[PDB]
Design an enzyme around this catalytic site. Structure first.
Site, PDB file in Angstrom:
ATOM      1  CB  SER A 190      -0.757   0.016   1.246  1.00  0.00           C
ATOM      2  OG  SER A 190      -1.906   0.715   0.881  1.00  0.00           O
ATOM      3  CD  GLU A 195      -5.992  -3.317  -4.458  1.00  0.00           C
ATOM      4  OE1 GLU A 195      -5.619  -2.348  -3.753  1.00  0.00           O
ATOM      5  OE2 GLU A 195      -5.520  -4.475  -4.293  1.00  0.00           O
ATOM      6  CG  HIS A 235      -5.901  -2.273  -0.162  1.00  0.00           C
ATOM      7  ND1 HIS A 235      -4.982  -1.816  -1.086  1.00  0.00           N
ATOM      8  CD2 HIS A 235      -5.472  -1.832   1.051  1.00  0.00           C
ATOM      9  CE1 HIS A 235      -4.039  -1.132  -0.460  1.00  0.00           C
ATOM     10  NE2 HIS A 235      -4.290  -1.168   0.839  1.00  0.00           N
TER      11      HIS A 235
END
Length: 292
Positions: free
Chosen positions: A143, A233, A263
């Site tokens: 991320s 996502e 995610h």
């Protein structure tokens, strides 16, 4: 289809806040601490400080002699911590037979960009000053962590650092302008609060700054990349462009868009078969890069 993400999307849907409710920052942080997975019991930890940051060396069974992973956790650059990411990183260490250095790098908005890059570079350097050998290193990260993986690479390369053997960004956010179709096209399939975090990290810096947003960087010279990302996502576009630019830039990557995934689905390995397997595969990939 498959049914574990179905149960789990339902679950995540019922627990998310509304659309654009405005959550305080310590309320968000504690949130994440309060629901973070307990690391498997067979995993051992050992706290260290590195470049003035707290850290844990995170070792599962299997762990081999020369090897290591600079792991960087996601959370928007404003949150997440050794604890929130200990469990998944244990698993990645288990799958890859290496111990992970799980860094608690500086977070915004107390520590704006380029703070967390300065931490990544400094940890990598440290791994080397410990005499881990570049080609025995791997660097990985989800991320926000995933973009930083990149940003630390460009950064260390600009400063003359030997590159590691692999890098494995998971669902990376590598574009702080958040302008990619996938924020629209992919929005109904995920569970802008992500823009407030840019704002928090950027603190007014260039949002196309290579080190903030490495999809605009020169990646020439970086090591083989394996990039994971879920079709469902919001951040999908960030991963495809990451792959494009690398390609463009001379780099090897394997983009693996996993379908019906969300995610960082890795984090749901305790109840999610693709979780388990995506992690196994992260392992095979660095093991592969290392065997070469």
């Amino acid at each position: 289809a498959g049914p574990e993400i179905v149960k789990l999307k339902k679950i995540l849907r019922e627990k998310a806040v509304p659309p654009g409710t405005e959550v305080p920052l310590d309320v968000m942080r504690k949130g994440m601490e309060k629901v973070a997975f307990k690391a498997a019991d067979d995993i051992q930890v050992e706290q260290v400080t590195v470049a003035g940051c707290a850290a844990e060396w995170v070792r599962a069974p299997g762990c081999q002699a020369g090897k290591a992973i600079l792991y960087l956790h996601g959370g928007g650059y404003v949150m997440g911590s050794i604890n929130t990411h200990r469990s998944m990183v244990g698993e990645i260490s288990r799958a890859s037979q290496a111990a992970a250095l799980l860094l608690d790098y500086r977070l915004a908005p107390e520590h704006p960009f380029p703070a967390a890059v300065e931490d990544g570079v400094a940890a990598y350097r440290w791994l080397l000053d410990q005499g881990f050998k570049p080609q025995h290193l791997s660097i990985s990260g989800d991320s926000a962590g995933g973009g930083l993986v990149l940003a630390v690479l460009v950064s260390a390369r600009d400063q003359g650092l030997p590159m590691p053997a692999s890098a494995i960004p998971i669902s990376p956010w590598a574009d702080m302008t958040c302008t990619n179709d996938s924020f629209k096209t992919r929005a109904e399939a995920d569970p802008g609060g992500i823009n407030k975090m840019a704002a928090r990290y950027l603190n007014g810096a260039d949002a196309k700054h290579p080190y903030a947003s490495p999809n605009f960087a020169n990646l020439k010279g970086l090591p083989p990349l394996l990039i994971h990302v879920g079709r469902d996502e919001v951040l999908l576009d960030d991963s495809i462009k990451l792959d494009a630019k690398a390609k463009a830039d001379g780099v090897k990557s394997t983009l693996e868009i996993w379908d019906d995934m969300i995610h960082v689905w890795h984090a749901f390995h305790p109840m999610l078969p693709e979780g388990k397997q995506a992690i196994v595969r992260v392992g095979e990939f660095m093991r592969e890069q290392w065997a070469a």
